[model samples]
Target chain A: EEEEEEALEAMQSRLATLRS
Target chain B: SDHGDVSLPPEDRVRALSQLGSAVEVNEDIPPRRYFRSGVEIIRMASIYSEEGNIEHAFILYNKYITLFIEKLPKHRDYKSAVIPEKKDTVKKLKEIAFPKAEELKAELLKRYTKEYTEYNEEKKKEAEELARNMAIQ
Candidate 1:
């Protein structure tokens, strides 16, 4: 769960960064 | 960046790997992907192929990776992969021995080369598919 959560957060951040 | 860095496309080297003319005007240039891993991998594969009697395939992989290396590092800049001393040595060794071996050894090289080439082509194919799929979705 921790790994999944972290992965999701990282992906979300990368998505937001790229989108912006 | 999160786990695989798979999204990271190949980084452009500061200069063309083959020549010394197109050095980056700035510092901290990033070199192509697998500069370290890929080159070494190719060399290892070439050796394996040579040992296994697949010279043609080995030579092709050897030549292909060598060619790719040159293209990546053509212009000698202070940025990524600036023709280090060891790399120069490697280039020299590969140039002299990777192709000119006995038929038996060469056959081994080809077998090894085939394995590496297969992997390389598969990666390229995957990347192409990913690009097409992404474009379609967008």
Candidate 2:
């Protein structure tokens, strides 16, 4: 639940979250 | 359907059966060990993914897990020492469902899980760098 959701959202958002 | 925060209770680990013929090396805590428990929690995760309408992610995790499960079956399939007959039956059922192409939907789920997990780890590392840089500035 931790990084799982966060990761999915990051990828979808493409908000440097993926890069970060 | 699922990946990251891969926290499953210890009971569900392969050690549940001791070293029975059906026993698998429990290393889910280890990174990328989702392959080990693919068929179990993963499928349920897939259902979750599908219901949520996140089909792409669901399909990815499903596939990766099936591949891992099938690849490791031979090594773990020594039914001779299986403590629980039902355990063997469960694995057997998984294999039956897998051959001639595993449950397609599930395969996709595994792919997504791996991708998501990798992405998650990547972000974690990157964030650590940002924190380190921020501290240096201060």
Top DockQ prediction, candidate number? 2
User: For residues B81-136, could you state the per-residue lDDT of candidate 1 as single tens digits?
Assistant: 34343454444544455334322343443344456556777898999999999999
Off by over 4 Å in 2: A1-20, B1-38, B76-86, B92-138
Candidate 1 differs from the real structure by a C-alpha RMSD in angstroms, to one decimal, of 20.1
Tens-digit lDDT track of model 2 for B18-128: 112122353533433333334567657756776797754454444444334433332343422333323343345344432212235434445555565667678888999
Q: What's the TM-score of each model vs. the native?
A: 0.33, 0.32
lDDT of 2 at B101: 27
User: How does model 2 score by TM-score?
Assistant: 0.32
- What number of backbone clashes does candidate 1 have, counting pairs of residues 3 or more apart or in separate chains? 27
